[PDB]
Design a protein around this ligand. Structure first.
Ligand SMILES: Nc1ncnc2c1ncn2[C@@H]1O[C@H](COP(=O)(O)OP(=O)(O)OP(=O)(O)O)[C@@H](O)[C@H]1O
Ligand SMILES: Nc1ncnc2c1ncn2[C@@H]1O[C@H](COP(=O)(O)OP(=O)(O)OP(=O)(O)O)[C@@H](O)[C@H]1O
Ligand SMILES: Nc1nc2c(ncn2[C@H]2C[C@H](O)[C@@H](COP(=O)(O)O)O2)c(=O)[nH]1
Ligand SMILES: Nc1nc2c(ncn2[C@H]2C[C@H](O)[C@@H](COP(=O)(O)O)O2)c(=O)[nH]1
Ligand SMILES: O=CN(O)CC(=O)O
Lengths: 343, 343
């Protein structure tokens, strides 16, 4: 039954999960791609030809040459307008023989109401203010008169998603019928609701157990976990929370790099030195089998080789057999290197 | 690393998870007992001597002869008054050499405000109205001025829990230092937020993936899953939701048994015939290794033997190796029989 490869972030997010998901989809040729994204932030993949996908709804794995199923988990929070645009942009990949399945209990974002509710926390905790938690709360209220929050009910008056919304039985059968599955996790380990930075965190745990639960994947289906990390972990701009005791906040000037910003709000990302403590904590809970170490282009060979080294000993210390298999030197498929080939 | 035994419910709850947890604790002698309960759930264990434990906070596994650690997960929602009463009632078991650990992000119930917020759903969906979701929502709001919702902040002004509230580091170390762990799940598979009965469901998924996430247990620690079921599945009284297509609602008079009353409330439980569809769905997602079939005292030998049989074929059909190892014939330790000894 072990046929699921799960992509997980080991730090505070924006490690390049979109790039490794697209790289693994092209290399391994999964028939099923699945996720449980909320509108907090996007995922970027750029192939060998320079074609770019920037997704908030659809998995980046839709680039798989053997694609048959695209699955949006029960933990999903999505804009219907955005989903329509993403499907349209990749119409060539999402042909007649590709089934798009939206879990009946996936949450429909009310762009006006859900973002207006998060205006306060967007400043107080540096929240993305995308309406993720406000939409989640509305679903949790379980009011039988509210037919405007879950995909199953919304589809009865908004026909744009009616062809995609499946039953719970169809969801379990789609997973059962799958040969090889790529499960795409979002956000970051240290952003977990139940990690130590509360309330400077997201609205859920960002762990393999929580991502498998949000996608309705039974635990025996898990084949391997692919953990992602940066040489210099980031946080979003503003009063976005603390860091670990073994790390320090840096400036983009100190790195000799162009300041990283969010795509839409243009908020300058906060940047930190590598944390071994964060790595031990992420290793203990996430237990990855393989690691992707990205943004190696920000350091000299001695620098990123030392971090590869720190990661593997941090894994061993927390009973984890994780091996750094991939190294990122840029944002495209061409910038992903095999560790064995460069060190 | 495989040292966690997880107790989960395969139906709509009240299958007797409290009884099997207490039975397994006395037989296997776990040093660590862990859960992530909410005030909607009551759990009962009665030992061989007649001593009764009715818990809403503490795991029932505290009856273990080798008890060293009692752990209340980050997913916990608890009344401090109730926790105080449960600790006092089991003072003999919770001696100086037993460490009680409350996750820093476990939620403190505000009995007035959280229960008042759930008055509506207590009738509309037959919710227990115990304040579980209202407390969960307050934590999700992540307001930095609110120091009254998570255990970590509450421990700074309410000294009743200050000795028990640990750090996230202490939590991971407690799990790492443990020899054998009993993880106690609550509610039921079919009550899951993302099963087909929405909005007639609870405020989370009741699956092994969600319960391991709510207790902060890494996936490689899972040794085995013990699924629980009744011969006649139940629901709470009122407009509490639908049933599966292969089952029918019965009466307590039709069964010739005394009407069961809900633990948190006082309402008469709704009772149904066994559902094979429910069992296949629960088997597919929960994937138990062992099964406890309880309330066999409500049927004749031919009747419960047929149900044991249906369960095992439902498991096989969903690629699950589950074996019915235990049979319940009453509410005490003495009423738990090994299947091999009676059929
Ligand atoms: N090594 C690299 N060098 C430079 N830019 C890169 C590199 N790898 C990825 N990027 C860019 O970094 C940005 C953040 O990455 P991306 O959105 O894919 O991350 P993510 O891990 O999926 O984020 P999150 O889950 O937090 O939304 C993107 O604009 C991406 O193209
Ligand atoms: N075989 C049995 N026959 C009769 N009564 C029983 C039997 N087993 C347990 N009981 C009683 O029936 C009730 C079952 O609820 P209990 O708290 O034990 O279950 P639970 O599975 O832990 O509940 P929850 O849904 O809240 O997680 C209790 O009052 C218990 O003492
Ligand atoms: N990089 C990144 N940060 C996120 C994401 N989701 C949440 N966060 C961070 C931003 C804030 O510091 C904090 C709270 O934001 P939010 O969950 O949107 O309310 O979590 C994500 O997908 N990526
Ligand atoms: N039997 C049982 N029902 C529960 C439990 N927790 C919740 N429920 C049911 C009662 C309602 O039908 C539904 C909504 O309840 P609540 O989670 O209290 O809002 O879930 C539990 O532990 N046992
Ligand atoms: O870089 C991506 N952002 O975090 C999301 C957006 O603002 O669009």
């Amino acid at each position: 039954m072990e046929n699921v490869d799960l992509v997980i972030d080991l730090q505070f997010g924006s490690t390049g999960k979109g790039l490794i998901a697209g790289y693994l989809a092209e290399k391994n040729g999964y028939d099923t791609v699945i996720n449980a994204n909320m509108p907090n932030a996007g995922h970027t993949y750029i192939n060998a030809e320079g074609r770019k996908w920037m997704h908030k709804v659809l998995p980046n794995g839709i680039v798989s040459p053997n694609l048959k199923r695209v699955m949006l988990g029960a933990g999903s929070v999505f804009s219907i307008n955005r989903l329509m645009e993403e499907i349209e942009m990749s119409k060539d990949l999402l042909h007649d023989k590709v089934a798009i399945l939206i879990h009946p209990m996936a949450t429909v974002l009310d762009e006006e109401a859900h973002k207006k509710a998060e205006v306060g926390i967007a400043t107080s905790i540096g929240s993305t203010g995308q309406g993720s938690m406000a939409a989640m709360v509305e679903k949790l209220q379980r009011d039988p008169t509210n037919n405007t929050i879950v995909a199953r009910d919304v589809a009865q008056y908004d026909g744009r998603i009616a062809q995609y919304v499946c039953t719970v039985e169809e969801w379990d059968m789609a997973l059962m019928a799958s040969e090889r599955i790529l499960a795409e996790g979002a956000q970051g380990f240290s952003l977990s609701l139940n990690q130590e930075f509360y309330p400077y965190c997201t609205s859920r745990d960002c762990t393999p157990a929580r991502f498998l639960a949000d996608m309705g994947i039974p635990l025996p289906m898990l084949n391997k976990v692919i953990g992602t990390a940066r040489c210099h972990p980031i946080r979003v701009g503003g009063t976005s929370g603390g860091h670990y005791p073994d790390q320090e906040e840096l400036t983009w000037e100190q790195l000799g790099q162009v300041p990283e910003l969010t795509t839409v709000t243009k908020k300058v990302r906060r940047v930190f030195s590598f944390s071994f403590i964060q790595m031990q904590k992420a290793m203990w809970t996430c237990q990855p089998d393989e690691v992707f170490l990205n943004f190696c282009n920000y350091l000299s060979p001695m620098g990123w080789q030392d971090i590869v080294h720190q990661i593997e000993v941090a894994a061993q210390s927390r009973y984890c057999d994780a091996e750094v298999k991939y190294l990122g030197f840029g944002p495209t498929f061409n910038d992903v290197e095999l560790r064995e080939d460069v060190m």
